[PDB]
Amino acid sequence: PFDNTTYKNLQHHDYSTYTFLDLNLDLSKFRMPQPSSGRESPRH
């Protein structure tokens, strides 16, 4: 069927105060290894 009268974006009603950070914690296992600048910090 085709719908044009309902708003299918109802997920944001259930987001808590840690949804973004839990999603980042979920996505931390899919990522490529970060490059290194030859040091620990620019004060090292």
Partner: protein, 213 residues
């Protein structure tokens, strides 16, 4: 409102603050996004995490973020006093942000601000004595066609009448959670007198694709 710190008993470097261990896993997830040698770039999420744990930033979260990221504490003081979200004073649980810039002042968000002020008995910047509602007045929040709109801690409440925001405050006082959307007859941002566009079905895969692709 002030951008210096005075060591009150409830706000000092001896004020208790430490992340929960799941928040330490979250800070690991934040720091692992940025390249090696630029760990300092994880100031702004982690410090916002240190606001989402406590509700506000005493000066121990600034010191803790400077301690776990090994950056100078002044470089976190600059971030906490530069950005308008890092509440350095204890706000209420429902931090109400009323947008009254020009596209919302044209659509009379002053009536909504007056309604919230007479409903809560407070004014802009003050806090209700039960420490539920903090009413301040902010700049453009990015819902300009959905003007006039307010923000409650994560949520946008849009196309508001004074009656609508009185209804939202009523269903916030009793402990319930409202629906973060436009309170008029439209759904997100469409023309209120019906869809003037995108009524046709989207075609799907393969439509209009050039050859050699």
């Amino acid at each position: 409102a002030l951008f210096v710190h005075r060591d009150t008993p409830k706000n000092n470097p001896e004020t208790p603050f430490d992340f929960t261990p799941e928040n330490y896993k979250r800070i690991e997830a934040i720091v692992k996004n940025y390249p090696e040698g630029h760990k300092a770039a994880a100031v702004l999420p982690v410090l916002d995490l240190a606001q989402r744990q406590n509700g506000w930033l005493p000066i121990s979260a600034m010191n803790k973020v400077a301690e776990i990221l090994q950056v100078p504490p002044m470089r976190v003081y600059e971030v906490a006093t530069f950005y308008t979200m890092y509440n350095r004073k204890p706000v209420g649980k429902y931090h109400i942000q009323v947008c009254t810039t020009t596209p919302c002042m044209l659509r009379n968000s002053d009536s909504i601000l007056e309604a919230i002020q007479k409903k809560l008995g407070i004014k802009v910047g003050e806090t209700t004595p039960d420490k539920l509602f903090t009413l301040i007045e902010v700049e453009c929040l990015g819902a300009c066609v959905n003007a006039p709109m307010v923000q409650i801690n994560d949520n946008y409440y849009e196309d508001l009448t004074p009656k609508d925001i009185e209804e939202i405050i009523d269903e916030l006082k009793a402990g319930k959670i409202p629906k973060p959307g436009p309170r008029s007859g439209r759904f997100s941002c469409e023309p209120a007198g019906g869809l003037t566009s995108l009524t046709e079905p989207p075609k799907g895969p393969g439509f209009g694709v050039q050859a050699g692709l």
